[PDB]
Amino acid sequence: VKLAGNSSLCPVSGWAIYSKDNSVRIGSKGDVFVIREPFISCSPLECRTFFLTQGALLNDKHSNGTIKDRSPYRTLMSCPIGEVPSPYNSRFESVAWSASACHDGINWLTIGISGPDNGAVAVLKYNGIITDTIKSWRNNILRTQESECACVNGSCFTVMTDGPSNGQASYKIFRIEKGKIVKSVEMNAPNYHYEECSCYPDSSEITCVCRDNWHGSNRPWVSFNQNLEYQIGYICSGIFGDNPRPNDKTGSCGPVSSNGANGVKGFSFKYGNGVWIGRTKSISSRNGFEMIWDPNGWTGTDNNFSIKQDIVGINEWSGYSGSFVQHPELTGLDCIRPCFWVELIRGRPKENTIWTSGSSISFCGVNSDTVGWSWPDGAELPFTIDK
Amino acid sequence: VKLAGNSSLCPVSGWAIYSKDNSVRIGSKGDVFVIREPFISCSPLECRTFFLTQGALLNDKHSNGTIKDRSPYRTLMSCPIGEVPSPYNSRFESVAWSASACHDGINWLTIGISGPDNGAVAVLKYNGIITDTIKSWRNNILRTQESECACVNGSCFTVMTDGPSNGQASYKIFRIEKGKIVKSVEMNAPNYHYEECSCYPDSSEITCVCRDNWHGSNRPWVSFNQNLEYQIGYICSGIFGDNPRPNDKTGSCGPVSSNGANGVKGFSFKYGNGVWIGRTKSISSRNGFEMIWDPNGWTGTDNNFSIKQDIVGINEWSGYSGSFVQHPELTGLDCIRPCFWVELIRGRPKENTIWTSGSSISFCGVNSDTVGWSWPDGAELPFTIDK
Amino acid sequence: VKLAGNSSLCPVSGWAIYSKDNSVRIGSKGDVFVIREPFISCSPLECRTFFLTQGALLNDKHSNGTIKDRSPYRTLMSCPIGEVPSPYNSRFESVAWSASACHDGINWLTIGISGPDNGAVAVLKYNGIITDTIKSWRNNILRTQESECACVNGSCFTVMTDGPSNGQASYKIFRIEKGKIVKSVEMNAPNYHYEECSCYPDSSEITCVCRDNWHGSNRPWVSFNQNLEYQIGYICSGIFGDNPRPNDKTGSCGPVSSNGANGVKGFSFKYGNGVWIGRTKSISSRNGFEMIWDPNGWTGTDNNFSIKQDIVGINEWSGYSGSFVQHPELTGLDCIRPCFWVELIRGRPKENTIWTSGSSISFCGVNSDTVGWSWPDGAELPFTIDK
Amino acid sequence: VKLAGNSSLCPVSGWAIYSKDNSVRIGSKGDVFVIREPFISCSPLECRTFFLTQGALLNDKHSNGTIKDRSPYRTLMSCPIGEVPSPYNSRFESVAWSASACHDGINWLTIGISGPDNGAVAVLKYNGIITDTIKSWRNNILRTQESECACVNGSCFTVMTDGPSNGQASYKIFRIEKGKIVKSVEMNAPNYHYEECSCYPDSSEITCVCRDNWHGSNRPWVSFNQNLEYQIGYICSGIFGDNPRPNDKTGSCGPVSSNGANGVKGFSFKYGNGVWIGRTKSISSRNGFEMIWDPNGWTGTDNNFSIKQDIVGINEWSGYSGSFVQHPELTGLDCIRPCFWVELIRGRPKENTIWTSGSSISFCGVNSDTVGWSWPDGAELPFTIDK
Ligand SMILES: *[C@@H]1O[C@H](CO)[C@@H](O[C@@H]2O[C@H](CO)[C@@H](O)[C@H](O)[C@H]2NC(C)=O)[C@H](O)[C@H]1NC(C)=O
Ligand SMILES: CCC(CC)O[C@@H]1C=C(C(=O)O)C[C@H](N)[C@H]1NC(C)=O
Ligand SMILES: CCC(CC)O[C@@H]1C=C(C(=O)O)C[C@H](N)[C@H]1NC(C)=O
Ligand SMILES: CCC(CC)O[C@@H]1C=C(C(=O)O)C[C@H](N)[C@H]1NC(C)=O
Ligand SMILES: CCC(CC)O[C@@H]1C=C(C(=O)O)C[C@H](N)[C@H]1NC(C)=O
Ligand SMILES: *[C@@H]1O[C@H](CO)[C@@H](O)[C@H](O)[C@H]1NC(C)=O
Ligand SMILES: *[C@@H]1O[C@H](CO)[C@@H](O)[C@H](O)[C@H]1NC(C)=O
Ligand SMILES: *[C@@H]1O[C@H](CO)[C@@H](O)[C@H](O)[C@H]1NC(C)=O
Ligand SMILES: *[C@@H]1O[C@H](CO)[C@@H](O)[C@H](O)[C@H]1NC(C)=O
Ligand SMILES: *[C@@H]1O[C@H](CO)[C@@H](O)[C@H](O)[C@H]1NC(C)=O
Ligand SMILES: *[C@@H]1O[C@H](CO)[C@@H](O)[C@H](O)[C@H]1NC(C)=O
Ligand SMILES: *[C@@H]1O[C@H](CO)[C@@H](O)[C@H](O)[C@H]1NC(C)=O
Ligand SMILES: *[C@@H]1O[C@H](CO)[C@@H](O)[C@H](O)[C@H]1NC(C)=O
Ligand SMILES: *[C@@H]1O[C@H](CO)[C@@H](O)[C@H](O)[C@H]1NC(C)=O
Ligand SMILES: *[C@@H]1O[C@H](CO)[C@@H](O)[C@H](O)[C@H]1NC(C)=O
Ligand SMILES: *[C@@H]1O[C@H](CO)[C@@H](O)[C@H](O)[C@H]1NC(C)=O
Ligand SMILES: [Ca+2]
Ligand SMILES: [Ca+2]
Ligand SMILES: [Ca+2]
Ligand SMILES: [Ca+2]
Ligand SMILES: [Ca+2]
Ligand SMILES: [Ca+2]
Ligand SMILES: [Ca+2]
Ligand SMILES: [Ca+2]
């Protein structure tokens, strides 16, 4: 049965550890893909980790040069949550160096972008069969979420970008039904920049929190209904969510320029005027992770907050993070439950290896007791192949 | 359908070998997790082996230092009984350095504790979805069975301990329904010590046989009904069950102080005034294993027994042991069948390696002919990684 | 339910990338079969890659000498599309050094040829059970498609060749029902040569495009109805499809003798007088791959064409290619969708290794936007075993 | 639904190759169990290979000394037919150094013998649950078929031996229902010797062809009905079936003394007065394999035969062989189809290695065209671990 997606997001006071794969530790000997850009998505029956492989295994010579983002060898694959991504346990999804995926309650939708930078093509699959494609409309790296799309009542929604990563680009919202693009809208967003959106359903509407790689240290957001009527803004909290970013201070409802260039994929959950912000602990590099509840941070610009929970230590590597939800159809609850994942990036450019790869952790929102700690990647670098 | 749990334990005259995984032997070459604290639990359709990984594989450098009990890398995972615990065949359950699991007849309950020693949190999952959490109440290594919880009529039961491992601690019993704690009781047990309980259902009541790490070389027990009304005692038999222990003498109905400090997880099955006792063969180390039937050993203090069956030879490594049961809903019998498993610990601290890991064997009680033998681990240490 | 096979081929404007397995890159470390002659075939539920193993893994000494085509160690196996062919994820099909397979909508049919060159036997299995055999009738390497057979209304069809690969041979067409040969016909085709046919259903009739290894650098074809009444010809286009071949010039409706000796397995899709041709980029070796639409190339001899889409760059290795289809029963479309795969051959005879193996890519035809690129094998040769 | 087992054995004129696993070649790199005593058995849905592992993988140090027959590390496991026996694709069955298994149409029965030579215990499991045990009655290596048991009308039948392998021993036939022994009879067979029976159903009765290890170079047989009323004899053919054996000459309907000591597990299929005999090609060692049709060989003593089909070349290693059948419930045929497997033994005692392991091939009987060839193991010895 189709996910209804019409209930509200469950309010939560804390985050309980849900999974840890130890991928890089295990890949030191085991046959584990070199990956990056992992994300989690759930069906009414199961949660899966999706990821972009480099078409190579850890500790093998073909992991050489895997700091490179886009190549014909990259593929979107998936495995059950918490298991290491191996050629022996992973399902093939598509050929992709940028991707998204989500389940509408009936079948998996996957979106995999491959091809040259000047003419990339997103291939849409529904239940593993090609159902549609869309080609680059600005000829400058067509790219998408690197996290799950959001589903409401049999329609799935995603955001794609085409154009400069360091200046004004073009941003489109899509509605997809059974793998067919049935509507798209280009956002009219002058002076905004959207990359790598983390999108979730909440009361039949979609909220996306994204990355301004151009000139924003706070995160831009876009919200829309099923007809793709939309609103845009930036998270106002002085608790800045991007990385890099400046010191916390008075915020802005527009892009905060200071340290605004570059960024990292991230997420936040809106609750009225309040916001749960996940972010790195460092203002300069992808180190640490923490969750912060700011009760008026969606719309208010002060840097006060009410709850902070430690997730990864400042002296440990982190990386991308993203939202995922668990629908009532899966959980039996009366609301849509918020969860998130964190990518723990190891290797280049911060460490002296020939490769770059990630492992992952994830957490789900609860209203019972939780504890801050650090659950880092834990691998000992360099590896044999690096010697 | 819910497991009734209302029939009695099958009377058994001996133990038939059920499984052996040869994990450490296989892990010399194959990709096998470093694990400890394995245990078995059954649904109405299958038996699974659960275990706490160290987030590392045997014969890899990340196995270095795995004598260490608690870290953020440890995860509870499971695989089909008798198969090696591998990243290619194991299902992820929970992030955990202490755990329990059982099946109510409908879905799996797992309990996984992680976090800092001074503020750990147990995460409960029902069918893999987080359903409850509970925080440490003594701030000193919140910890649980390391074997299966027990289920009666749709409720599951477990025991957790928090506080000193070398003096009076705090012991709680829980009733859990669909992964939610619906009642807990703190045991009023001054001068008793309970760790790592092996609990089983019998005529709608739960009996747990546990480990006194403080000052008892005989095993403490707690029995309770579905309302958590409980009774406590120590096994009276002069056939002492813990390790270390003194040589068999006249026993006691309270804790036997002689060699009472420290211990090993173990189990026993009560039959009226009699008891089936599983224990190491050595009185000083985790070597050997044997099953002993003492017809008056639950309540009586002499050291006379009438059946002894060899399981692991005295010159071979053993370790933890625990009960599991097979319910009528699985077996088609008219009673609950008692079974047990033994963990065979290899590596530190007794052997010259950088790592510690275990393999397992298991047996089921029958009333047909059986035989004693020795079914040891059989790996040849040290391994390549140790040289 | 049986595949009807009565609708027409979907007209297509381009080819969207569907799968890429990265087998050779991954097999540098992981346990991946040495294979050649892969192909894809679909059921109403799933698509699988079939392949002929060499009974050996990459980077192991038993890969030595695997340039050799026929041995008793070769087996037909299959795995899900896009996954690497590993002993841990592959289903065994048959013992075979030449093969075909297809699904009639109810069960898989496989055809596996093994035995001596002077008396080989094809073993037919339906749902994994042996249902028929046919022995060599010319005693000179009985051999078959190395791609999927074609099914219409509960009957499946294939072509086999027996006799010289450098001169006139004998060619038979078979109708197979539930794994039993129910009719066969020997083609009367003087001066034709048919090897390794790629056959697809289209409006209840079968069209095969094959390899002339004797004296044609264009491809021979045969089409037939369910009663095995047949027509024969060569693709007339001056855009020659075989490898090796001459530079494009005026074509022939018979075999083009210029550079006509030898060849490579290939395919083409007929649309009226037009043809989609897949071919290598190099005229002299198995390098590069491209798809070309020639609006009058089935029957016209000019070398003019409308569309070209790049698949593999001319400086990268390619190899065999073949057609596969996805029926309406799988896709929900009102027509039969054409797709194709390409084998990317690495090792001998072109590279300094002891072994020969391939990886694969595949594409499906669509009417939405697509893009040419190069999706090559990507392995770095030689491997450890070659030193 | 229960297998009826009431139709006759299909008459067959030749043997078509069914499977080949290449286990030893693949295990040179991949994670493949050291095994011996493989056998095949089918359910109404699938065919599986069963085997006795040595609790160790190929090319690892724990494969040392695996010439040894009985140890506590040996386990019965199974995998789909034609797949390599790996810890990643194998199902655990039982702890066993002698075994049998068969499917009654409803569930798998496995029988696994372990324990000391003077008191071994067979453990019976039905659907993986222990259902019965039987202990040694002569205290001298209780042992069984090492091939599939035979099922008729919901009852399964096997033969076990206890006592000397070089003189008169004790042989029992068992009827088993839902894993419970419901009847047994001790065979009154002075001067007969029965080891390692290959038994098959045929028209509601069971026929077993076994190994005389005491003083016969032809094979003993026993036939019985569902009530365990039985008859005994030896295959009369002068085409001697055992290994070692003398050169063919006039046979005996009793044990042929010449070269009678020792032997190898094998099989034969009775058709009236005639017999299909599978045997090694060498009269002195386990080399080569061939199928021979002797139209009066069940009952007549001449060495005349009418068909011979080569299976393994005389210069190649062979080993155990055994029957298995495919019932009408699986095949859709109106008779019971005879098939057989051959174990190809590599390593000790004939080759310079520290280990012994086998691969397997299998064939099914057909009435269509077939061919002889050699399908040998193909591994290159010694392995890395041997050097
Ligand atoms: C296991 O861990 C120990 C550290 O706890 C490693 O020993 C160290 O090796 C480094 C060289 O990288 C030396 O500089 C240190 O002095 C060593 N420490 C100690 C306490 O000896 C050891 O190499 C590890 N073994 C592995 C990874 O195989
Ligand atoms: C091309 C712009 C884009 C978003 C800013 O770059 C991303 C930077 C990422 C990063 O900052 O780590 C890595 C991503 N793999 C990459 N995406 C693509 C499609 O290459
Ligand atoms: C902390 C007390 C506890 C019980 C005595 O210690 C156990 C001793 C065990 C042991 O005796 O081998 C190892 C266990 N993994 C450990 N449990 C935890 C949670 O670390
Ligand atoms: C025997 C003739 C045949 C077709 C021309 O050769 C093929 C050449 C092939 C090739 O050109 O690469 C390799 C094939 N495996 C081989 N087929 C067999 C059965 O050996
Ligand atoms: C103990 C007698 C028996 C049959 C003659 O020996 C067999 C000889 C076999 C052989 O000849 O290769 C190997 C078997 N694994 C062994 N069976 C057992 C249970 O050890
Ligand atoms: C959500 O949708 C379902 C299906 O229509 C409906 O029954 C339910 O009332 C809705 N819940 C809301 C609106 O919160
Ligand atoms: C990685 O690539 C660099 C540059 O091509 C090369 O010099 C180096 O040898 C490579 N390292 C490995 C381990 O392949
Ligand atoms: C959801 O979709 C269904 C089916 O298309 C449609 O009929 C209905 O209007 C929608 N329901 C809600 C709650 O919007
Ligand atoms: C156990 O409970 C079941 C379900 O109520 C019942 O059918 C059965 O008779 C009970 N057995 C007892 C009370 O011993
Ligand atoms: C078992 O559970 C059912 C449902 O809650 C209840 O009605 C019944 O009384 C229970 N039996 C007991 C408590 O023994
Ligand atoms: C294909 O066959 C089906 C089933 O007979 C039929 O319903 C359909 O009309 C056919 N399609 C054609 C002839 O195009
Ligand atoms: C491959 O085979 C050749 C010829 O027999 C042999 O000389 C060579 O050593 C082999 N190479 C390997 C790595 O086995
Ligand atoms: C398809 O097959 C069925 C069963 O033989 C037959 O009745 C029907 O006429 C066939 N349709 C055709 C030939 O298109
Ligand atoms: C075999 O037994 C079945 C009943 O179990 C009967 O219907 C059939 O006629 C018998 N004959 C065969 C198929 O051998
Ligand atoms: C196997 O054991 C033999 C005899 O003890 C010994 O000579 C040899 O070194 C061992 N080999 C390995 C690799 O364990
Ligand atoms: C199988 O056994 C019993 C009678 O002995 C009964 O279920 C059935 O009639 C039998 N079927 C036969 C004789 O094939
Ligand atoms: Ca930014
Ligand atoms: Ca605030
Ligand atoms: Ca103690
Ligand atoms: Ca006593
Ligand atoms: Ca040619
Ligand atoms: Ca043209
Ligand atoms: Ca003999
Ligand atoms: Ca004769």
Side-chain angles (χ1 to χ4, degrees), chain C residues 122-145:
Chain C
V123 176
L124 285 71
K125 294 180 182 187
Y126 189 65
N127 199 23
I129 303 296
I130 296 181
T131 42
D132 217 341
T133 67
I134 175 165
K135 191 168 183 169
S136 183
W137 67 91
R138 294 293 182 234
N139 304 311
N140 194 353
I141 318 175
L142 175 61
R143 58 206 184 262
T144 191
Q145 295 178 253

Short mmCIF file of all heavy atoms in Angstrom, two decimals, chain C residues 122-145:
data_model
loop_
_atom_site.label_atom_id
_atom_site.label_comp_id
_atom_site.label_asym_id
_atom_site.label_seq_id
_atom_site.Cartn_x
_atom_site.Cartn_y
_atom_site.Cartn_z
N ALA C 122 24.38 -30.61 -26.62
CA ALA C 122 23.68 -29.53 -25.96
C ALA C 122 22.71 -30.15 -24.95
O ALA C 122 21.95 -31.05 -25.29
CB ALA C 122 22.91 -28.68 -26.97
N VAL C 123 22.78 -29.69 -23.70
CA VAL C 123 21.85 -30.15 -22.66
C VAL C 123 20.87 -29.03 -22.39
O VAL C 123 21.27 -27.90 -22.04
CB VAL C 123 22.61 -30.52 -21.37
CG1 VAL C 123 21.63 -30.88 -20.25
CG2 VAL C 123 23.59 -31.69 -21.63
N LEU C 124 19.58 -29.32 -22.58
CA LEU C 124 18.51 -28.37 -22.31
C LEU C 124 17.90 -28.64 -20.94
O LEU C 124 17.57 -29.77 -20.61
CB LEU C 124 17.40 -28.46 -23.37
CG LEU C 124 17.70 -27.86 -24.75
CD1 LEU C 124 18.72 -28.70 -25.53
CD2 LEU C 124 16.42 -27.74 -25.56
N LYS C 125 17.75 -27.57 -20.16
CA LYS C 125 17.11 -27.65 -18.86
C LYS C 125 15.94 -26.69 -18.80
O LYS C 125 16.02 -25.56 -19.30
CB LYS C 125 18.09 -27.32 -17.74
CG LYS C 125 19.23 -28.31 -17.55
CD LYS C 125 20.14 -27.86 -16.41
CE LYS C 125 21.34 -28.79 -16.21
NZ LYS C 125 22.10 -28.38 -14.97
N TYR C 126 14.86 -27.13 -18.18
CA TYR C 126 13.70 -26.26 -17.99
C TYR C 126 13.46 -26.24 -16.50
O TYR C 126 13.27 -27.29 -15.90
CB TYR C 126 12.50 -26.82 -18.76
CG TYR C 126 11.29 -25.91 -18.81
CD1 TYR C 126 11.33 -24.70 -19.48
CD2 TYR C 126 10.11 -26.27 -18.19
CE1 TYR C 126 10.21 -23.86 -19.54
CE2 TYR C 126 8.98 -25.46 -18.24
CZ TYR C 126 9.04 -24.26 -18.91
OH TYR C 126 7.92 -23.45 -18.96
N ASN C 127 13.53 -25.06 -15.89
CA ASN C 127 13.47 -24.96 -14.42
C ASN C 127 14.55 -25.81 -13.76
O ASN C 127 14.32 -26.41 -12.70
CB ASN C 127 12.08 -25.36 -13.90
CG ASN C 127 11.80 -24.85 -12.50
OD1 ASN C 127 12.40 -23.88 -12.05
ND2 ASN C 127 10.88 -25.52 -11.81
N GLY C 128 15.72 -25.89 -14.39
CA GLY C 128 16.86 -26.59 -13.81
C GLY C 128 16.83 -28.11 -13.95
O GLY C 128 17.73 -28.79 -13.45
N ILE C 129 15.81 -28.64 -14.62
CA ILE C 129 15.71 -30.08 -14.83
C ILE C 129 16.03 -30.41 -16.28
O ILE C 129 15.53 -29.75 -17.19
CB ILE C 129 14.27 -30.57 -14.53
CG1 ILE C 129 13.87 -30.20 -13.09
CG2 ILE C 129 14.15 -32.08 -14.78
CD1 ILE C 129 14.74 -30.89 -12.02
N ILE C 130 16.86 -31.43 -16.52
CA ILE C 130 17.19 -31.79 -17.90
C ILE C 130 15.95 -32.27 -18.64
O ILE C 130 15.24 -33.16 -18.16
CB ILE C 130 18.30 -32.85 -17.99
CG1 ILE C 130 19.60 -32.32 -17.43
CG2 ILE C 130 18.51 -33.26 -19.45
CD1 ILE C 130 20.75 -33.32 -17.52
N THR C 131 15.67 -31.66 -19.79
CA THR C 131 14.45 -31.95 -20.54
C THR C 131 14.72 -32.47 -21.94
O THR C 131 13.84 -33.08 -22.57
CB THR C 131 13.54 -30.70 -20.65
OG1 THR C 131 14.35 -29.55 -20.94
CG2 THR C 131 12.77 -30.45 -19.35
N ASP C 132 15.92 -32.24 -22.46
CA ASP C 132 16.26 -32.71 -23.80
C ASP C 132 17.76 -32.60 -24.02
O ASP C 132 18.47 -31.92 -23.25
CB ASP C 132 15.52 -31.91 -24.88
CG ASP C 132 15.08 -32.78 -26.07
OD1 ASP C 132 15.63 -33.90 -26.24
OD2 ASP C 132 14.18 -32.36 -26.82
N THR C 133 18.26 -33.29 -25.04
CA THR C 133 19.63 -33.09 -25.48
C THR C 133 19.65 -33.14 -26.99
O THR C 133 18.75 -33.69 -27.61
CB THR C 133 20.62 -34.18 -24.95
OG1 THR C 133 20.30 -35.45 -25.54
CG2 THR C 133 20.58 -34.30 -23.43
N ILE C 134 20.66 -32.53 -27.59
CA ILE C 134 20.90 -32.75 -29.00
C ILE C 134 22.40 -32.82 -29.24
O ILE C 134 23.16 -32.02 -28.72
CB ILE C 134 20.21 -31.70 -29.91
CG1 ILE C 134 20.60 -31.93 -31.37
CG2 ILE C 134 20.55 -30.29 -29.46
CD1 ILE C 134 19.72 -31.21 -32.37
N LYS C 135 22.82 -33.82 -30.01
CA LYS C 135 24.23 -34.03 -30.25
C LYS C 135 24.66 -33.41 -31.57
O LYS C 135 23.85 -33.24 -32.48
CB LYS C 135 24.55 -35.53 -30.23
CG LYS C 135 26.03 -35.85 -30.20
CD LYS C 135 26.26 -37.31 -29.88
CE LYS C 135 27.75 -37.63 -29.78
NZ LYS C 135 27.92 -39.00 -29.21
N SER C 136 25.93 -33.04 -31.65
CA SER C 136 26.56 -32.57 -32.89
C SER C 136 26.17 -33.45 -34.09
O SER C 136 26.24 -34.67 -34.02
CB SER C 136 28.08 -32.62 -32.69
OG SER C 136 28.79 -32.12 -33.81
N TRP C 137 25.74 -32.82 -35.18
CA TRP C 137 25.37 -33.56 -36.38
C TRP C 137 26.42 -33.45 -37.48
O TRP C 137 26.33 -34.14 -38.49
CB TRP C 137 23.99 -33.11 -36.89
CG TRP C 137 23.97 -31.68 -37.41
CD1 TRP C 137 24.20 -31.27 -38.70
CD2 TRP C 137 23.71 -30.49 -36.65
NE1 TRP C 137 24.10 -29.90 -38.78
CE2 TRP C 137 23.79 -29.40 -37.55
CE3 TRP C 137 23.40 -30.24 -35.31
CZ2 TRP C 137 23.59 -28.08 -37.13
CZ3 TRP C 137 23.19 -28.93 -34.91
CH2 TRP C 137 23.29 -27.87 -35.81
N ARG C 138 27.40 -32.56 -37.31
CA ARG C 138 28.51 -32.46 -38.25
C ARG C 138 29.84 -32.80 -37.58
O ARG C 138 30.88 -32.79 -38.23
CB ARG C 138 28.61 -31.05 -38.86
CG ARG C 138 27.44 -30.66 -39.75
CD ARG C 138 27.40 -31.50 -41.04
NE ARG C 138 26.30 -31.08 -41.89
CZ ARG C 138 25.35 -31.89 -42.37
NH1 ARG C 138 25.38 -33.19 -42.09
NH2 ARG C 138 24.38 -31.40 -43.13
N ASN C 139 29.80 -33.07 -36.28
CA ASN C 139 31.02 -33.43 -35.53
C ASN C 139 32.13 -32.39 -35.61
O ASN C 139 33.31 -32.73 -35.72
CB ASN C 139 31.52 -34.80 -35.98
CG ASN C 139 30.46 -35.87 -35.83
OD1 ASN C 139 29.84 -35.98 -34.77
ND2 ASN C 139 30.20 -36.61 -36.89
N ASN C 140 31.75 -31.12 -35.54
CA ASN C 140 32.74 -30.05 -35.67
C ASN C 140 32.30 -28.83 -34.86
O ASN C 140 31.86 -27.83 -35.42
CB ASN C 140 32.98 -29.70 -37.14
CG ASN C 140 34.22 -28.83 -37.35
OD1 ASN C 140 34.85 -28.38 -36.39
ND2 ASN C 140 34.57 -28.58 -38.60
N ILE C 141 32.43 -28.96 -33.54
CA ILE C 141 32.14 -27.90 -32.57
C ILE C 141 30.70 -27.37 -32.63
O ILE C 141 30.48 -26.22 -32.97
CB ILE C 141 33.14 -26.72 -32.65
CG1 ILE C 141 34.57 -27.23 -32.84
CG2 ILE C 141 33.04 -25.86 -31.39
CD1 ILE C 141 35.62 -26.12 -33.06
N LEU C 142 29.74 -28.23 -32.30
CA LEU C 142 28.37 -27.78 -32.09
C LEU C 142 28.40 -26.56 -31.17
O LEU C 142 29.05 -26.58 -30.13
CB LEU C 142 27.55 -28.89 -31.43
CG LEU C 142 26.12 -28.52 -31.04
CD1 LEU C 142 25.32 -28.13 -32.27
CD2 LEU C 142 25.44 -29.66 -30.28
N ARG C 143 27.72 -25.49 -31.56
CA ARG C 143 27.82 -24.24 -30.81
C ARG C 143 26.59 -23.36 -31.01
O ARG C 143 25.84 -23.55 -31.97
CB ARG C 143 29.08 -23.47 -31.22
CG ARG C 143 29.16 -23.15 -32.72
CD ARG C 143 30.63 -23.00 -33.11
NE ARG C 143 30.85 -22.60 -34.51
CZ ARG C 143 31.15 -23.45 -35.49
NH1 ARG C 143 31.23 -24.76 -35.26
NH2 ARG C 143 31.39 -22.98 -36.71
N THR C 144 26.38 -22.41 -30.11
CA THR C 144 25.13 -21.67 -30.14
C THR C 144 25.31 -20.18 -29.89
O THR C 144 26.40 -19.63 -30.10
CB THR C 144 24.02 -22.35 -29.23
OG1 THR C 144 22.74 -21.75 -29.47
CG2 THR C 144 24.36 -22.26 -27.73
N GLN C 145 24.26 -19.51 -29.42
CA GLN C 145 24.21 -18.04 -29.48
C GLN C 145 25.21 -17.24 -28.64
O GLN C 145 25.70 -16.21 -29.10
CB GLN C 145 22.82 -17.57 -29.10
CG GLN C 145 21.72 -17.98 -30.03
CD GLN C 145 20.38 -17.49 -29.52
OE1 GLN C 145 19.56 -18.26 -29.03
NE2 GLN C 145 20.17 -16.18 -29.58
#
